[PDB]
């Protein structure tokens, strides 16, 4: 079950960010209470504006942090998706001579399969086996001529 490490990692990161935001909804931020309705019910507007402003400042800062982290994560995912598109184009729709772009060995073909929030490539590769020692020579001398 450890094959889909990256997809699970992405899902966990997004869930962690959302859970952190929801939990940040419940920190006093210095105000009398972490709930807005009780602040409005217990105090007059002149004396409630201070607590409302404290809560507003805290919640706005938390939202800004969430948005910035999401932007950076989106940049990383966009880079990954660009790589995936390039791999699809140059390995599924053709045969790549790049040394280790698609699997280890000499590329033959690749097959795409879908995934929850990704794509998996099955890289079929020709790898030589069963070596054998031999004695070689750069050329052959025949009638004084060099044969390559």
């Amino acid at each position: 079950a450890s094959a889909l490490g990256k997809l699970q990692d992405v899902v966990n990161q997004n869930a962690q960010a959302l859970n952190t935001l929801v939990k940040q909804l419940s920190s006093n931020f210095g105000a009398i209470s972490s709930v807005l309705n009780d602040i409005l019910s217990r105090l007059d507007p002149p004396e409630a504006e201070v607590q409302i402003d404290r809560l507003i400042t805290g919640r706005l800062q938390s939202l800004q942090t969430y948005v910035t982290q999401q932007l950076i994560r989106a940049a990383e995912i966009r880079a990954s998706a660009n790589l995936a598109a390039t791999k699809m184009s140059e390995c599924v729709l053709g045969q790549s001579k790049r040394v280790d772009f698609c699997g280890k060995g000499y590329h033959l073909m690749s097959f795409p399969q879908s995934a929850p929030h990704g794509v998996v490539f099955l890289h079929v590769t020709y790898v030589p086996a069963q070596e054998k020692n031999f004695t070689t020579a750069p050329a052959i001398c025949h009638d004084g001529k060099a044969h390559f």
Partner: protein, 166 residues
Amino acid sequence: LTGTGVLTESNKKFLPFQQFGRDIADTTDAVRDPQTLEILDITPCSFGGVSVITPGTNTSNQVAVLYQDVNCTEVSNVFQTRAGCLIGAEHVNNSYECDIPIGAGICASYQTQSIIAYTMSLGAENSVAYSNNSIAIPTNFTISVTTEILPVSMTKTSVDCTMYIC
């Protein structure tokens, strides 16, 4: 001037009109005793983070504790590495593939019954029999299929600012 730290004799040459002393980042690291005019050096007490090395809950219940950037002089088996002092893991002269990377090329693992700390092995020691007139040529092939998994998109979530704040 109030602080917490360890005081030691200092070689700093204060001029006869200087009482304090500021290191980089504007921190007070030297002070003059107001009764003996002694030049004392102030340095912060030892501190650092602790780390727990676990082989898994359902595999075992024993752990090793690493005190990062702390000499062993400050508080089963203690073994000194390049990143802090280790406690609860024995040292082995063998080399294995890295399982739980501690740092500075030192890993830890669960092997027979106990936690062991070793220096990780990069790999085998294959030496190709290179000669100026001999080559090796394959006689058979074993085509192989591998996988590569790449995420492409996230969940489309939009959060309302006004309803979130108010």
